[PDB]
């Protein structure tokens, strides 16, 4: 075995099953949702074209990395003549494969050079290096405009940032005047209309009246609901004690299985009359054998005791939280209201993405929800929801469904579709939860057919797609001219981070 | 070709590479930390010896399940013997393998029966069926007492439950008198000393003054910390504006890397003096090219601007949330204080488990933390910590490290050891977060050598270990006498849930 230097991995570089080299132009960092937005949208392209320095580590340009990769292939190809003597025609296959990759890589190098030298009369590329807050090059914008599987969405945070860099968002709603368009640069000028305003002003009003968040654990909800029908003075005592206890057991059981069958229908058979060994839960058992309560105990203590004796502790294990419920007891500041408003808007945006990627609607949902009376209404229902501790996602889905037609939808969203949206929302929101700015996000679905791909933690397009567009078709691709279509013929737009085909020459050794 | 009926899976049943059948006696449900505690501790053993009913579904005893398995092997053995005319000897190996498993299974059946019939004259087994809140049988207690990889810990909730069932906890602290030991059964009798009391009374005092929880994101923490040395009136203006800006950049940088090197030391080289392209961050750039701030802007706006211009958005990606910060703004009830008190105690217990399983100490850390002045001191620091939004875990680790010797430790805990404890703590606490009682937990490490195993979501011991101990060595195991050592010679104490060996005797034919 001879020591090869060709790496199994370079940035932006993917090799398919047929030994075609693809270069992937990055748009932003991330997998499905971009972590970069606004001010920082250009960061990946700056690096791809010019290199940069991140947290003290030098990141090299694509061109610089293709040159390094070329040297490495050339050294590997030199070493296969010498190797050739040890195996005249037993290293044949890998040599052909390496030369094929080399020729391709050389062509990409010429394309990057000719792009920067001949075809950047606009400075569309050079402004990545020179501009203050650079823009996406126009070819990237065109690729995004035309995408069928990736879409930007733009929201309305109170303290909005003017430097959005995704110009064709699918979802969009009215925004304030950014502080950065005001002479002091300190505060926005607010608008008193639209989805953003309604949410904020409903969730924490001019009054400063907090909105309570009454989210309980399943156990507390059930216990609280049962105890609704009792008063503090109520006891399990007197002549009818056995009968009052039975009433208690039955209400508690009905309430607990009602809540549980929402999530798991197996619990339709759950029973609180008996312990797991078949012992009757009755007065004598709880008071005189176990000694846990007595005639003077409050109804809440009896509930606790009943539950401790009959319910597996696996039934109390929680669901994963909604992003809507983060542990706070109240919405008690403008900042609390902004945070929730954004979460509501982001959910509407995910629903909008879902309907656009699955070809149900072309509408911008924000156009509908910015209008009265919808803006006020959805805000009001979300607020009620928090006060009741209700699930917030369905409140949004019902409102969508009651207006499906006006949102460009043939039919209401099915329960399955709602859950798919909720899951995307939850995962994408959590990835993005700590963003310094919430004005816009780019969201890509690499499991669908389209011009955007996922690769090495970058949301990307095909370099040749970009090249053809910035170049306006004036420089034909030659040997690479079918590479774009070849990547489309692949099974998934999600691309393996390593290049297996390069290691399968070392595996055979 | 015959279809075989022997199942690939039975409860408690594991078959190793050499065709040895192992029966695993369950202690409690779970993987690393038991979900059963107190009153429910016995549930798995009740079920293993007698069966029981869970959420309306019957769970059958080991004995019943071994019998079913036996019938199935017998059918499989009939069906090979009907094929001896048709395929003279072609089934030989598998027939031996099935008879071997059958004999083993029959022996286990005999052992369970003989244990219940001849070796239970104290009713140590029978009490699981007949007692109110049963105990672990003595052999299980002996196994736990001598385990090197699993340990119970006992805590002090305010409203403590007397029915603990883990008798030899590693970590233990003073407790109140349980309400269940009082004639009314309504409230515990409190002690005014010890870790539990100090935590509760410090975190929410008799005053009823709330303790603020001022938790911030990494970004807000850093910004807040920097701004704590500036006044609202401070500006980046005047003759020394460039110099004041450099001071700001240096402080901001120092503070940000201090916070980041805790999680990842790669950020020791992070710099805020240049953007990723090498553009110097100075007054002219921020005020006149980007136009984000001016001379009158507050220092907070300059910080925002500096950070947006120099920091990758990957650095704001959060660590998993600590159980200590659950989204609340304040500790404002006895309940809130009890909840936090438990979390602090559980962390100390996890540290104690870590030091015991890795052979750093044999001490009960609770003995140390119950004593003054440590009980008061650790409470007072945890309270300061919440008020400052500091990480709580390191506060506990520093206090341990400053007293490592009195806690039986040769050296302080390393940064790595701390993070390992934090991860265990976090994952275990979240698993048990909804327990109806927090008095005790059983924690097992199946990646270490010892007498306790993980199998089919049950924390288990070897049945034969248990058998030999309950019978006091008076009934030798015969053919099974080396099965215990054989399971120890395995690679892991995490046992595969299915039995591959039973499915792979079919591949060879
Ligand atoms: Hg910026
Ligand atoms: Hg109980
Ligand atoms: Hg079994």
Q: What is the distance in angstroms between the CA of the first residue and the CA of the last residue of chain B?
A: 10
Phi, psi of B286 (to 5 degrees): -80, -35
Taken as a whole, chain A contains a residue count of 509
What distance in angstroms lies between residue A161's CA and the mean position of ligand 1's atoms? 10
Cis-peptide into A373, omega within 30 deg: yes
Q: What is the 8-class DSSP label of residue A238?
A: S
Contact A55 B316 (CB under 8 A): no
Q: Cα(A115)–Cα(A334) distance, rounded to whole angstroms?
A: 49
**Same structural domain for residues B183 and B236?**
no
What distance in angstroms lies between residue B336's CA and the mean position of ligand 3's atoms? 44
Q: Which of B277, B433, B440 would you mutate first to test chain A, the one with the most A CBs within 10 A? A: B277
Contact B56 A270 (CB under 8 A): yes
Residues of A in contact with B36 (CB under 8 A): 313
What distance in angstroms lies between residue B40's CA and the mean position of ligand 2's atoms? 6
In a domain, A474, yes or no: yes
Say how many C-beta atoms besides its own lie within 10 A of residue A220's C-beta: 11
In a domain, B140, yes or no: no
What distance in angstroms lies between residue A305's CA and the mean position of ligand 2's atoms? 7
Contact A184 B318 (CB under 8 A): no
Cβ–Cβ < 8 Å for A258, B35: no
In a domain, B139, yes or no: no
Which of B316, B346, B379 terminates a domain? The answer is B316
Name the residue in chain A with its Cα closest to that of B264.
A55
Residues of A in contact with B41 (CB under 8 A): none
Any idea what the Cα angle at residue A286 is, between residues A285 and A290, rounded to 5°?
85
**Same structural domain for residues B128 and B26?**
yes
Phi, psi of A376 (to 5 degrees): -70, -40
> Which are the contacts of B253, defined by CB distance < 8 A and separation ≥ 6?
B270, B271, B272, B273
Q: What is the 8-class DSSP label of residue B254?
A: H
Residues of B in contact with A271 (CB under 8 A): 56
> Does the CA dihedral A425-A428-A433-A438 come out positive or negative?
negative
Q: Which of A159, A277, A335 would you mutate first to test chain B, the one with the most B CBs within 10 A? A: A277
Contact A180 B294 (CB under 8 A): no
Taken as a whole, chain B contains a residue count of 509
Contact A318 B186 (CB under 8 A): no
**Same structural domain for residues B205 and B338?**
yes
Contact B328 A326 (CB under 8 A): no
Contact A267 B55 (CB under 8 A): yes
Contact B315 A277 (CB under 8 A): no
In a domain, A172, yes or no: yes
Q: Cα(B61)–Cα(B277) distance, rounded to whole angstroms?
A: 69
Say how many C-beta atoms besides its own lie within 10 A of residue A392's C-beta: 21
Q: Is B170 helix (H, G, I), strand (E, B) or coil?
A: coil
Q: Which two tokens stand for residue B226?
A: 């920097």
> Quick one: which H or E segment has residue A145?
helix A138-145
Long-range CB contacts (within 8 A, 24+) of B332-335: B332/B204, B332/B210, B332/B211, B333/B204, B334/B158, B334/B200, B334/B204
HSE of A15, CA atoms in CB hemisphere, 13 A: 22
Cβ–Cβ < 8 Å for B433, B427: no
Any idea what the Cα angle at residue A11 is, between residues A8 and A15, rounded to 5°?
50
Q: Cα(A260)–Cα(A222) distance, rounded to whole angstroms?
A: 10
Q: Cα(A90)–Cα(A170) distance, rounded to whole angstroms?
A: 55
Nearest-CA distance from A118 to chain B in Å?
Answer: 23
**Same structural domain for residues A92 and A123?**
yes
Q: What is the 8-class DSSP label of residue A240?
A: T
**Same structural domain for residues B304 and B389?**
no
Phi, psi of A192 (to 5 degrees): -115, 45
Residues of A in contact with B185 (CB under 8 A): 291-294, 297, 301
**Same structural domain for residues A353 and A376?**
yes
* Three-state helix/strand/coil letters over A340-409: HHHHHHHHHHHHHHHHHHCCCCCCCHHHHHHCCCHHHHHHHHHHHHHHCCCCHHHHHHHHHHCCCHHHCC
Longest CA–CA separation in chain A, Å: 104
Contact A46 B294 (CB under 8 A): no
Contact A56 B308 (CB under 8 A): no
**Which among A278, A294, A313 has CB closest to B40?**
A313
Task: Please report the resolution in angstroms.
Answer: 2.6
What does the DSSP assignment read for B207-275?
A: T-PPEE-----HHHHHHHHHHTTS-TT--S-STTHHHHHHHHHHHHHHHHHHHHHTT-GGGGG--SSB-
Cβ–Cβ < 8 Å for A156, A175: yes
What distance in angstroms lies between residue B133's CA and the mean position of ligand 2's atoms? 7
- Ligand nearest the Cα atom of residue B109: 3
> How is the beta sheet containing B452-455 ordered, strand by strand?
B13-15, B21-29, B458-462, B452-455
Q: Cα(B203)–Cα(B196) distance, rounded to whole angstroms?
A: 11
List helix spans (H) across A435-480.
Answer: 463-470
Q: Cα(A100)–Cα(A103) distance, rounded to whole angstroms?
A: 5
Q: Which two tokens stand for residue A175?
A: 């925004």
Cβ–Cβ < 8 Å for B191, B160: no
Contact A269 B296 (CB under 8 A): no
Cβ–Cβ < 8 Å for A198, A345: no
* Three-state helix/strand/coil letters over B49-62: HHCEEECCEEECCH
Contact B436 A307 (CB under 8 A): yes
Phi, psi of B275 (to 5 degrees): -75, 175
Q: Cα(B152)–Cα(B160) distance, rounded to whole angstroms?
A: 16
Q: What is the 8-class DSSP label of residue B122?
A: T
**Same structural domain for residues B61 and B129?**
yes
Q: Cα(A457)–Cα(A495) distance, rounded to whole angstroms?
A: 10
Beta bridge partners of A34: A30
HSE of A210, CA atoms in CB hemisphere, 13 A: 10
What distance in angstroms lies between residue B65's CA and the mean position of ligand 3's atoms? 5
Give the rounded distance of the alpha carbon of A276 from its chain centre.
43
Contact A276 B54 (CB under 8 A): yes
Nearest-CA distance from A233 to chain B in Å?
Answer: 15
> Quick one: which H or E segment has residue A492?
none
Q: Cα(B24)–Cα(B38) distance, rounded to whole angstroms?
A: 22
Cβ–Cβ < 8 Å for A171, A348: yes
E runs forming strands in B143-210: 150-154
Nearest-CA distance from B411 to chain A in Å?
Answer: 34
**Same structural domain for residues A340 and A426?**
yes
In a domain, B490, yes or no: yes
Which of left, alpha, beta for A295 (phi over 0: left; psi -120 to 50: alpha)? alpha
Q: Cα(A369)–Cα(B3) distance, rounded to whole angstroms?
A: 61
Q: Which two tokens stand for residue B50?
A: 């007698």
Q: Which two tokens stand for residue A265?
A: 């229908």
Beta bridge partners of A212: A330
Cβ–Cβ < 8 Å for A85, A72: no
Q: Cα(A267)–Cα(A256) distance, rounded to whole angstroms?
A: 9
Dihedral, B118, B124, B126, B132 alpha carbons, nearest 10: 170
Number of domains making up chain B? 3
Say how many C-beta atoms besides its own lie within 10 A of residue A410's C-beta: 8
What distance in angstroms lies between residue B188's CA and the mean position of ligand 2's atoms? 17
Residues of A in contact with B339 (CB under 8 A): none
Q: Cα(B338)–Cα(B470) distance, rounded to whole angstroms?
A: 39
Name the residue in chain A with its Cα closest to that of B57.
A269
**Same structural domain for residues B156 and B192?**
yes
Give the position of tokens 């507390």: A220
- Nearest CA to B270 out of A457, A41, A53 is that of A53
Nearest-CA distance from B20 to chain A in Å?
Answer: 32
Residues of B in contact with A315 (CB under 8 A): 55
Any idea what the Cα angle at residue A503 is, between residues A497 and A509, rounded to 5°?
165
Q: What is the CA radius of gyration of chain B?
A: 30
Q: How far is CA B62 from CA A145, A227, B69, B105, in A?
A: 64, 41, 10, 11
Q: Cα(A106)–Cα(A112) distance, rounded to whole angstroms?
A: 10
Cβ–Cβ < 8 Å for A196, A368: no
In a domain, B5, yes or no: no
Q: What is the 8-class DSSP label of residue A333?
A: S
- Ligand nearest the Cα atom of residue B291: 1
- Ligand nearest the Cα atom of residue B59: 3
Nearest-CA distance from B35 to chain A in Å?
Answer: 7
What distance in angstroms lies between residue B90's CA and the mean position of ligand 3's atoms? 29
What does the DSSP assignment read for A411-438?
A: SPPPHHHHHHHHHHHHHHHHHHTT-S--
**Which among B43, B57, B316 has CB closest to A436?**
B316
Q: What is the CA radius of gyration of chain A?
A: 31
Q: Which two tokens stand for residue B159?
A: 């409203």
In a domain, B295, yes or no: yes
Phi, psi of B462 (to 5 degrees): -80, 130
In a domain, B145, yes or no: no
Name the residue in chain A with its Cα closest to that of B281.
A132
**Same structural domain for residues A237 and A99?**
no
- Ligand nearest the Cα atom of residue B293: 1
Q: Cα(B341)–Cα(B201) distance, rounded to whole angstroms?
A: 9
Say how many C-beta atoms besides its own lie within 10 A of residue B451's C-beta: 19
Task: Report helix, strand and coil shares of chain B as percent, to nearest 5.
Answer: 45, 10, 45
Name the residue in chain A with its Cα closest to that of B328.
A328
Cβ–Cβ < 8 Å for B178, B197: no
- Nearest CA to A34 out of A344, A458, A354, A496 is that of A458
Q: What is the 8-class DSSP label of residue B201?
A: H
Nearest-CA distance from B52 to chain A in Å?
Answer: 5
User: Pairing between strand B452-455 and B211-212?
Assistant: unpaired
**Same structural domain for residues A29 and A127?**
yes
Q: Cα(A365)–Cα(A350) distance, rounded to whole angstroms?
A: 10
Cβ burial of B28 (10 Å; 0-12, 13-18, 19+) is buried
Residues of B in contact with A332 (CB under 8 A): 329
**Same structural domain for residues B346 and B429?**
yes
Query: Domain limits at B92?
Result: 13-134+447-503
Which of A443, A465, A481 terminates a domain? The answer is A443
> Which are the contacts of B264, defined by CB distance < 8 A and separation ≥ 6?
none
Q: Cα(B317)–Cα(A36) distance, rounded to whole angstroms?
A: 12
Q: Is B208 helix (H, G, I), strand (E, B) or coil?
A: coil
Cβ–Cβ < 8 Å for B194, B374: no
Q: How were these coordinates obtained?
A: X-ray
Nearest-CA distance from B485 to chain A in Å?
Answer: 33
Nearest-CA distance from A182 to chain B in Å?
Answer: 10
Phi, psi of A273 (to 5 degrees): -80, -25
Contact B54 A312 (CB under 8 A): yes
Cβ–Cβ < 8 Å for A369, A192: no
Give the position of tokens 């515990």: B188
> Which are the contacts of B50, defined by CB distance < 8 A and separation ≥ 6?
A277, B61, B128, B129
User: Pairing between strand A13-15 and A21-29?
Assistant: antiparallel
């Amino acid at each position: 075995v001879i020591k090869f230097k060709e790496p199994e991995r370079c940035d932006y570089l993917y090799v398919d099953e047929n030994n075609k080299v693809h270069i992937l132009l990055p748009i932003v960092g991330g997998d499905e949702i971009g972590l970069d937005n606004t001010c920082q949208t250009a960061v990946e392209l700056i690096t791809f074209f010019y290199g940069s320095a991140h947290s003290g580590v030098t990141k090299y340009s694509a061109e610089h990395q293709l040159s390094e990769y070329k040297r490495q292939l050339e050294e590997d190809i030199k070493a296969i003549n010498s190797q050739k003597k040890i195996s005249p025609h037993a290293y044949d296959d890998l040599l052909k494969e390496k030369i094929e990759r080399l020729q391709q890589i050389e062509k990409y190098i010429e394309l990057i050079q000719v792009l920067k030298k001949q075809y950047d009369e606009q400075n569309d590329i050079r402004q990545l290096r020179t501009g203050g807050i650079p823009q996406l090059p126009s070819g990237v914008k065109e690729i995004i405009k035309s995408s069928e599987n990736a879409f930007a969405v733009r929201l309305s945070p109170y303290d909005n940032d003017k430097f959005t860099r995704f110009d064709d968002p699918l979802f969009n709603v009215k925004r304030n005047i950014s502080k950065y368009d005001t002479p002091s640069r300190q505060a926005p000028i607010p608008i008193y209309e639209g989805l953003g305003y309604r949410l904020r002003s409903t969730l924490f009003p001019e009054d400063k009246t907090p909105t309570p968040i009454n989210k309980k654990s399943l156990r507390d909800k059930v216990k609280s609901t049962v105890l609704s029908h009792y008063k503090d003075e109520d006891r399990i005592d007197g002549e009818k004690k056995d009968e009052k206890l039975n009433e208690l057991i039955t209400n508690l059981q009905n309430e607990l299985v009602k809540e549980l069958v929402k999530s798991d229908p197996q619990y339709s058979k759950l029973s609180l009359s008996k312990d797991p060994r078949g012992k009757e839960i009755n007065y004598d058992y709880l008071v005189n054998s176990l000694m846990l309560v007595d005639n003077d105990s409050e109804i809440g203590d009896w509930i606790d005791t009943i539950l401790d004796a009959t319910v597996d502790s696996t039934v109390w294990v929680a669901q994963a939280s909604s992003p809507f419920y983060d542990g706070a007891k109240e919405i008690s500041s403008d900042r609390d209201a902004d945070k929730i408003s954004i979460r509501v808007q982001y959910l509407l945006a995910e629903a909008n993405i879902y309907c656009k990627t699955n070809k149900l609607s072309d509408a911008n949902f924000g156009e509908f929800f910015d209008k009265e009376p919808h803006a006020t209404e959805i805000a009001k229902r979300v607020k009620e929801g928090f006060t009741q501790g209700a699930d917030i996602e369905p409140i949004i889905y019902d409102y969508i469904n009651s207006n499906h037609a006006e949102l460009g939808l043939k039919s209401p969203l099915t329960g399955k579709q709602q859950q798919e949206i909720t899951d995307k929302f939850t995962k994408h929101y959590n990835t993005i939860k700590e963003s310094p700015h919430f004005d816009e996000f780019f969201v890509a679905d690499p499991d669908k057919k389209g011009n955007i791909f996922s690769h090495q933690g970058r949301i990307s397009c095909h370099f040749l797609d970009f090249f053809t567009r910035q170049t306006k078709g004036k420089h034909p691709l030659g040997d690479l001219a079918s590479h774009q279509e070849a990547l489309q013929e692949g099974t998934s737009n999600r691309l393996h981070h390593k290049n297996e085909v390069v290691a399968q020459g070392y595996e055979k050794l």
